[PDB]
Amino acid sequence: IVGEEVPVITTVDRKEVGIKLKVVPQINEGNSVQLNI
Amino acid sequence: KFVADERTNSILISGDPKVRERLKRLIKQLDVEMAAKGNNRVVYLKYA
């Protein structure tokens, strides 16, 4: 994440906004990569 | 007749020197150890 945590009413809570990439790769035993993104 | 110890894992015998001939034969007969069977296997999943 490149961004900022900003508070939001709900009370209040910290929510992150910006450029964020959450990836979980697993590699086929050669070449192709599977991505849960 | 027959004995063994699994402290030592050794056949003991009670009886003949014919029992000594044939039961040194069976001392030797089942001494063999089975080759590994790959009873378990670790498989690398490519996709799933």
3-state secondary structure of A3: strand
Amino acid identity of A18? G
Q: Tell me if A28 and B47 make a contact (CB, 8 A cut-off).
A: yes
β-bridge pairing A33-36 and A24-27: antiparallel
Q: Is A28 on the interface with B (CB under 8 A)?
A: yes
B48 touches chain A (CB under 8 A): no
Whole-angstrom Cα distance, residue A25 to residue B23? 63
Instruction: Characterize A3-24 residue by residue with b for buried, 16 or more Cβ atoms within 10 angstroms of its Cβ, and e for exposed.
Output: eeeeeeeeeeeeeeeeeeeeee
Q: What angle do CA B42, B43, B46 make, to 5 degrees?
A: 150
Resolution attained, angstroms = 3.3
Contacts of B46 in chain A (CB under 8 A): 28-29
* Closest residue on chain B to A26 (Cα): B47
